[PDB]
Symmetry: C2
Subunit: 252 residues, 2 copies
């Protein structure tokens, strides 16, 4: 109740801009808002795949037959809504506002590879109906914990957002969280219990970065999220395993 | 072979399908004009509940960004994904005007909202108000990266006149009993009706004319129509057993 609030406020985590920079870079799909070309005066929403380029600018592969493509050609001002955990309503949600710009011929090759890195089977991007567009950010806004005590919000300029680096350990979140959630969830419960002093019934690893990881934990009927910081910054894929064993050894 | 079965299988009309799916949805993506960032649109996740006419009811906090957006410009849109993770699924965008609910309509609107969000106790707090998106146009797209790409739009009058299918409300219990315990029965029915030797058949939704399934042979969706319209919950069980016997 009060121990959770005191632990979360002190636990090491990425800075706000690095968290938003990292979550966006790891995201591959979101909700595009445009000005409706056909229904004048109304906005319009659609689902789009995307991939951030090296600067964090979303790359879209848009079909000339899509409604949202016609919207963007008539008015390039748009927004992109990202949900870290789409089903979690208390999760982090990011809105990137910017201007959709056709990618130049010089930039085609770098843009195409950045997009296929996130959508490896998207070989329609070479078809004539499809073009790459880049949403050049104007402002990046986020909200977190809507119906919770740890409600936070903020915004970043284009310059602040682009200067932040993507955390180099977050890319390993999927393999690490799988091996732990499938085979070694007892270890996660002990580590969380050792650090937070909460005897959690279950501890599910949500994400991962160089400073630690977050877990979905359950105690009685309440479900809540806990930050589990590493004793030091993780340096690589293997170092993440080393630190988990060290935190387990410090408990087990 | 799939295309010939899908084009002939009985299903709800387009406007009744969209009316039914929207009425069954309780969360979506709201697009607004950004009050703070002049010239830009904005997106947010919102809970909602359709009223009896199909108009989405929102319970908005005075502290939320999208509330300030809607108060500055009521013109908005609501994006609903029947199966949000299925990229070929049906997606509906309702465009309309967000209107404060009047004092006379508060009670009916509150009950419509709590029917879909029974634990939303905060709707009574002072920070919260009910808004209704009065529809201007309802647009849909389906099978966006498939051979069966379809689209269309409905006026406010066409959308409001359509009825919500009275059997779709039973989709969750029926699909649970079948997908967990009787997927062999579902596979037999699908193979019997479509003449497709399906390896697995996962029941997706339900209406009075049949149900849709996710099937795999050597992944695609198949419509499984009932031999006649189902009249109630028990009749759905009667018809499924009847189709299994065949």
């Amino acid at each position: 109740f009060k121990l959770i609030q005191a632990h979360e406020e002190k636990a090491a985590r990425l800075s706000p801009v690095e968290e938003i920079r990292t979550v966006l870079n790891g995201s591959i799909c979101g909700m595009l808002s445009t000005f409706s070309q056909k229904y004048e005066g109304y906005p319009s929403g659609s689902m789009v795949d995307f991939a951030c380029d090296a600067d964090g600018s979303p790359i879209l592969a848009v079909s000339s037959l899509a409604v949202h493509t016609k919207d963007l050609l008539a008015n390039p001002k748009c927004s992109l809504l990202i949900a870290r955990d789409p089903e979690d309503r208390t999760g982090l949600r990011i809105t990137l506002h910017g201007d959709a710009v056709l990618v130049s011929e010089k930039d085609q090759a770098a843009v195409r590879s950045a997009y296929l890195a996130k959508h490896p089977k998207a070989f329609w991007v070479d078809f004539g109906d499809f073009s790459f567009m880049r949403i050049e950010p104007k402002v990046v806004r986020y909200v977190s914990g809507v119906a919770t005590a740890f409600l936070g919000s903020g915004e970043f300029s284009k310059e602040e957002y682009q200067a932040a680096k993507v955390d180099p350990i977050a890319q390993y979140a999927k393999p690490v969280t799988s091996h732990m959630n499938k085979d070694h969830e007892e270890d996660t419960k002990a580590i969380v219990h050792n650090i937070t002093s909460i005897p959690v019934e279950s501890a599910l690893m949500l994400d991962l970065d160089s400073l630690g990881f977050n877990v979905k934990a359950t105690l009685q009927g309440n479900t809540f999220k806990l930050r589990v910081p590493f004793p030091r910054r993780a340096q690589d894929r293997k170092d993440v395993k080393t630190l988990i064993v060290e935190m387990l050894q410090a408990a087990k």
